[PDB]
Ligand binder design. Structure first.
Ligand code: D16
Ligand code: D16
Ligand code: UMP
Ligand code: UMP
Lengths: 264, 264
């Protein structure tokens, strides 16, 4: 989509070569922001084919508060397999922090129903935030939160969200991370009787792995297609009540898929 | 500064009227990014005289892990007075989270020592982060962290920093918060023998209070002037050892100060 392909060109035009944790090497920029108006269409990348099925299941998993991959395995999603231990555990990553952030005096905060209650009862709050960056449990996590912190905002009956992604693999994770949060914004807005506004993506270390260069130029030679449309077929009683079958993407005609190795 | 006045105008042309928690009223936008190259000069606003003494003592108060305004008073800095209790405490705000984030099991993480050790031993890390947004202690704080989360980055021997500020009073808090983190970048870079890079500012709810319209219009009438340069006179033996006397600003020629009421 125009924003995404301009980001790729930007990393190529001004990225600095950097060595990294996995030993693969990246081309990197620091600091970027893009905005997607969710009323223009659902932001699912069309210059390569993305698997919506994996995106939806991972988001339903996060919302259930789950951090073990068995659910994802029951649904034929293997995107988190490489970081899971022998028991299928990833440690207190996203789902646990969203649904049960532990306090130092023995409580657990459910940040997702806190946010829902804020949007319903106090939508002009400047504190409507969900953080996955829990400094005291970072060491128990298989991988530190890439999409770390996000904030909601309501203006003129529309819900907007801004995500700070501290680390971003542009080719592989970012198509998935944009679609996932746009989906979350449609579900929140449906629960609060709000319209969808903007998804704003802000990035920290935004990079392209050295072994993704050919597939990046191949993708960069393609014209974006019209954006698909998201249809939710049901309003569940709670945001924790949605299921895969409630969503319908319409009009998605992508270019061929492009395979790329994930750096572990 | 060009970017600062540009944001100021953008909030006026684009802002939506919001009833906020103080019953004052704001015009706000959501999602904004600004980039300051620290090689070009220290970003202290010149279209109004800013008081650097207050900026320095607050940042030094933060690095000492102190949340009691007694120290600020010892140095006659009055900025946090309206939020402290009968004993001068603000609760576990900025300073406490930066130097002793409480783990669920009773320990504390010093995020500043962690960051110094990462910049020295692993500068390619994509995890060099300080979070003041401690979900389990927010209810104890007099005001929730405005400048909430920040990340360091190193490329080509230069140290960059991005701040995510979830709530921003453009006229009062922002000149102050920008100078504050530019200063911290200069001190970290000196301790880690790096050159300064970019200070990237990203805002969430970015606003102008209804009772600052006149002084915002006054400020928008003034030509920005060349940026000052910062000199750190002494190299302390740790980042916890700077003192007010070690910093000099040079070439700071501002337009006259502009007085404006704070919303409490
Ligand atoms: C280096 C690295 N980059 C990543 O983007 C990344 C992503 C996740 C998890 N995640 C959020 C994923 C999103 C997309 C993925 C992926 O493997 N995509 C394949 C297709 C998988 C499928 O069939 O659905 C692809 O798009 O080619 S994995 C975990 C660690 C990571 N590590
Ligand atoms: C509504 C609100 N807006 C703020 O910007 C704000 C800022 C702080 C703390 N802070 C970050 C402060 C920075 C600057 C301030 C101020 O009143 N400045 C005056 C005079 C003080 C001085 O610097 O000598 C000025 O800049 O002229 S207060 C606390 C609560 C807030 N509340
Ligand atoms: C992490 C997880 C996700 O959902 N999407 C992402 O883009 N990533 C990427 C970022 C980086 O390339 C790697 C995580 O490694 P690190 O912790 O930043 O070193 O996966
Ligand atoms: C908070 C403190 C700071 O250092 N900088 C800021 O700009 N502010 C402002 C933001 C907002 O106007 C107010 C805090 O109120 P709220 O918690 O956002 O409702 O102070």
């Amino acid at each position: 989509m125009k924003q995404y392909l301009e980001l790729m060109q930007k990393v190529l035009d001004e990225g600095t070569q950097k060595n990294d944790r996995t030993g693969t090497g990246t081309l990197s920029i620091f600091g970027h922001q893009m905005r997607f108006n969710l009323q223009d269409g659902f932001p699912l990348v069309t210059t390569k084919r993305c698997h919506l099925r994996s995106i939806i299941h991972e988001l339903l998993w996060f919302l259930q508060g789950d951090t073990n991959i068995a659910y994802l395995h029951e649904n034929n999603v293997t995107i988190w397999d490489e970081w899971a231990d022998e028991n299928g555990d990833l440690g207190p990553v996203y789902g646990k922090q969203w649904r049960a952030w532990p306090t130092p005096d023995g409580r657990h905060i459910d940040q997702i129903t806190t946010v829902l209650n804020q949007l319903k009862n106090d939508p002009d709050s400047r504190r409507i935030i969900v953080s996955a960056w829990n400094v005291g449990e970072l060491d128990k996590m298989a991988l530190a939160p890439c999409h770390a912190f996000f904030q909601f905002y309501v203006a003129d009956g529309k819900l907007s969200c801004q995500l700070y992604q501290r680390s971003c693999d542009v080719f592989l994770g970012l198509p998935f991370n944009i679609a996932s949060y746009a989906l979350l914004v449609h579900m929140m807005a449906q629960q609060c009787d709000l319209e969808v506004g903007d998804f704003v993506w802000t990035g920290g270390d935004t990079h392209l792995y050295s072994n993704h260069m050919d597939q990046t130029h191949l993708q960069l030679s393609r014209e974006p297609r019209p954006l698909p449309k998201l249809i939710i077929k049901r309003k569940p009683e709670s945001i924790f009540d949605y299921r895969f079958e409630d969503f319908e993407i319409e009009g998605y005609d992508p270019h061929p898929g492009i395979k790329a190795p994930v750096a572990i």
